[PDB]
Amino acid sequence: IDGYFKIYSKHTPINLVRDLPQGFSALEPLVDLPIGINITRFQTLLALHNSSSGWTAGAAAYYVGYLQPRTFLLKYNENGTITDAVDCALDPLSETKCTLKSFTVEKGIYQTSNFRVQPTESIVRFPNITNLCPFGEVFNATRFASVYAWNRKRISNCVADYSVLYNSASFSTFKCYGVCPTKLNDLCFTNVYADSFVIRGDEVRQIAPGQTGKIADYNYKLPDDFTGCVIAWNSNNLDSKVGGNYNYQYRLFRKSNLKPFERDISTEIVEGFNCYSPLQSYGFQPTNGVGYQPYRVVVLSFELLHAPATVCGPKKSTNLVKNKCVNFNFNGLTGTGVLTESNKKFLPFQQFGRDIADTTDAVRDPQTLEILDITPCSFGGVSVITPGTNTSNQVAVLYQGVNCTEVPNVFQTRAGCLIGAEHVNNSYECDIPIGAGICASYQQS
């Protein structure tokens, strides 16, 4: 375990000649060594001697078994010694014993667990978009705009591989809000908006939700419910000039603060006492300190509307499986369930339906535009019907609310599928109640 080689042992006399004893005992810790190595194979070492037959030995034999992850109920006696145990995965009776935390079970019916049908296949469906998103066209631009007059571009009808930006070492910051950047490739959006500008290093701190300052208030602001990523990098070698690259400016004065994604390029104040030009140039120079050097900033904002997505990450569309329990993903809409043809009369503008539980129960396929119904895979409770353990160890199992055809002495009742019980056409007083007029008893079977 984690590099620790643990040994347990026990040594007792045995009355058997050539087998293992039927009974119970526990092994005690012998040694625990911090070895720190991987083990995949092993071999047993024996002592040999040189006889007339060559290298030989007296009779020797051993047994080898393997361990598996299991749950056990262990019983400690008064002296703190383990005297008994239950393997909770051995059979339905042992499961009942573990559930009831006892080695003895009384006559009756007990619910021990639940069953669920697992998905047999996975499918993925995305829009048939072939173009790639022009991110390089924005990031690798020769010039960026001033912050008081920030630019915006819309990205649509394309595939966006966000790992090209995320894993880039060219960026000093890559701060995402509302979304994890490593998961962007699994999402679809209606649109993505890219805003860009040049500011000082120290001003990059203002490019976020809930911020204030000369830039946050008068040049560029993000909303409190912003979802997107803020990307910035040093451009001192590009956007700086000797004498000051005063071509870049920012808004210094305004009568009121801006709203999110607002822009104001008015040049209204002549100058004089208490009268100043609203814009202030940047003294961007190659010899400036790190926080005073120019940085290029790009902000990617995500848009979600009830409409076919036009910006999706990398896609691997598959075929469509029906009438089976499957995993699915419709334009980012993941889940597990059975998909079938729908009888729901959707109107052309409707892409999916919803229940009162706030779940999707029907979708429009992004490629065929047909409507599919979504249902959960079969599940239900499992109960064990037993005589007391003082009578017998034979049990019957009831699968609640399910057909016997979906389960894999098999009787179908209104309570569910009953397996292990022998149905008879006689009638008696009710012993162990099952439901809907049906009871069971020990008559032996």
């Epitope: 690798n140 631009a141 020769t142 010039r143 590009l238």
Partner: antibody, heavy 126, light 106 residues
Amino acid sequence: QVQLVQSGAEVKKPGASVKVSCKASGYPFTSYGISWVRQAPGQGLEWMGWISTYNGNTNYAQKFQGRVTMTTDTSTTTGYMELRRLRSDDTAVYYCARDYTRGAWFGESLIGGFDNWGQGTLVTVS
Amino acid sequence: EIVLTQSPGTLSLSPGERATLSCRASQTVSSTSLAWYQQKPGQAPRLLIYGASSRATGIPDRFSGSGSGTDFTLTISRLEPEDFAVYYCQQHDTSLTFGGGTKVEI
């Protein structure tokens, strides 16, 4: 890798026209545009124009205004250029290249150059 | 349009020697809008440097360059037999133009 393949050499009379193809492979056709230049025998590079593979937008050197036109075919991922009203001075080798100097979507200048050049198409006018 | 002038016309150098090639624009050109090319006899040209700070794919590290204002430089730290070719400067700050070309020969 990324490659461009052009047409073979042709000989034309004065007043005629020549069409040169540029078949692209190894990259998404609509990610990068196709640029065109030519070189007269023993001379340097003369820019003719550039076409966007994404939206079909074109830009030309002033010298070739009204003389050179361009088009793209996305289904065959191929660019084309045509020079009209040929003269004896149009004897040159014509080249295409993958462009990273102009955006194909926004038309803005980018940090890049002409790469993945074709083999060149020689056109003679007599 | 902006005209590019290269200098010197031709360098005469032995194998193993260092070479420097200059280009001057008639107008100020941003470094982000400039590139360098190389061409061998009978062959199509190739991009060597784009942005004046970044080499093209497949280009050896012996190739470099820099510049500002109107004056830009292409350098080769050590000439190989394959470097004795014709080089060009290009800009796309205004329209798109190429220089007259410069040659390096033995």
